[PDB]
Structure formats: C-alpha cells, structure tokens
Swiss-Prot record, chain A:
Protein name in the entry: DNA-directed RNA polymerase subunit omega
Lineage: Bacteria, Bacillati, Actinomycetota, Actinomycetes, Mycobacteriales
GO MF terms held by the record: DNA binding; DNA-directed RNA polymerase activity
tRNA-binding listed as a keyword: no
GO biological process: DNA-templated transcription
Reaction(s) the record says it catalyses: RNA(n) + a ribonucleoside 5'-triphosphate = RNA(n+1) + diphosphate
UniProt keyword annotations, A-Z: DNA-directed RNA polymerase, Nucleotidyltransferase, Transcription, Transferase
Assembly and binders: The RNAP catalytic core consists of 2 alpha, 1 beta, 1 beta' and 1 omega subunit. When a sigma factor is associated with the core the holoenzyme is formed, which can initiate transcription.
Recorded family membership: Belongs to the RNA polymerase subunit omega family.
EC number, UniProt record: 2.7.7.6
Reported function: Promotes RNA polymerase assembly. Latches the N- and C-terminal regions of the beta' subunit thereby facilitating its interaction with the beta and alpha subunits.
GO terms under cellular component: DNA-directed RNA polymerase complex
Coiled coil spans: none
Curated annotation (Swiss-Prot), chain B:
Complexes and interactors: The RNAP catalytic core consists of 2 alpha, 1 beta, 1 beta' and 1 omega subunit. When a sigma factor is associated with the core the holoenzyme is formed, which can initiate transcription.
Cited function: DNA-dependent RNA polymerase catalyzes the transcription of DNA into RNA using the four ribonucleoside triphosphates as substrates.
Name of the featured protein: DNA-directed RNA polymerase subunit beta'
The family this protein is said to belong to: Belongs to the RNA polymerase beta' chain family.
Gene: rpoC
Organism per entry: Mycolicibacterium smegmatis (strain ATCC 700084 / mc(2)155) (Mycobacterium smegmatis)
Length: 76, 66
C-alpha cells in the first residue's frame, strides 16, 4: 500500500485519517473546530501541537495533527 | 395587481424562485480549458480572476507582511 508521497491538500492521506475519527463527517468537524481553535490561538487557546510550517494554514495543521494522534474527540 | 399571496404562489414565488437558487459572493465563473500538467486534486485558476477571488485573503497576508 505505497503512494510514494502526497502533495498539497491530499497530504495527509484520507484513509489514514478515516481510521482516527468515527467517519469523514466527524473528521470534518474534528479538523474544523481544531482549525478554528488554531485560528483563535494567533488572536480556547491550545496549539499548535505539531511543529507548523513557516507560512502554513490551520486546516493543514489540524489535518496533520489528527493523523499524528495528538487529539481526542467526543461524539454528542 | 400582484397580491400579498401572489408573492408566495407561482414559479416566481418566494418559496420557489427567491429561496432555492440565489447569487453568491466569494465566487467566480469562467471558460474551462484542459490542464494535463495538473495533479487530480489541483485545478488551474486564471490569475486575474484568482487575485479578485481571494482579494481579502491576500489583503490579510499583505497586512500580515510589511
């Protein structure tokens, strides 16, 4: 199961994210709320956890983080 | 004369026409060409469109930078 390397938005790969959260629909909010938090930190102020890029976006950071298993979620 | 109920009834009704399909901001339209250099997830955007389409986002980073 080799893809050489991902690039841009397709990094990180979705199948490795779907393992982490219950479903893509959860993963969306999972990433989104975290991203809204990361957005807020620059201005709930926790993060960024993983060492971010120089000019990197909160969505990329959030979607990177979920893949790393630095976060945990509760389904309402 | 267009009545009060005539606002709601018809194909030009409030319920039908002016609730199901609207105009949207932060949105463009253009003619499509092929981009076989691009990866599946990538799409090519005309720079003169893009500039206006992301104007506030690029303004934000342009104020973030000096």
């Amino acid at each position: 199961s080799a893809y050489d390397t991902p690039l841009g938005i397709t990094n990180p790969p979705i199948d490795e994210l779907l393992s982490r959260a219950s479903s893509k629909y959860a993963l969306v909010i999972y990433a989104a709320k975290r991203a809204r938090q990361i957005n807020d930190y620059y201005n709930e102020y926790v993060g960024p956890l993983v060492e971010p890029g120089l000019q990197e976006k909160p969505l990329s950071i959030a979607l990177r983080e979920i893949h790393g298993d630095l976060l945990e979620h509760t389904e309402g | 004369l267009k009545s009060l109920s005539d606002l709601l009834k018809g194909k030009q009704g409030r319920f039908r026409q002016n609730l199901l399909g609207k105009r949207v901001d932060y949105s463009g339209r253009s003619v499509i060409v092929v981009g076989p250099q691009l990866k599946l997830h990538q799409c090519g955007l005309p720079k003169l469109m893009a500039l206006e389409l992301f104007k506030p986002f690029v303004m934000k980073r342009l104020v973030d930078l000096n």
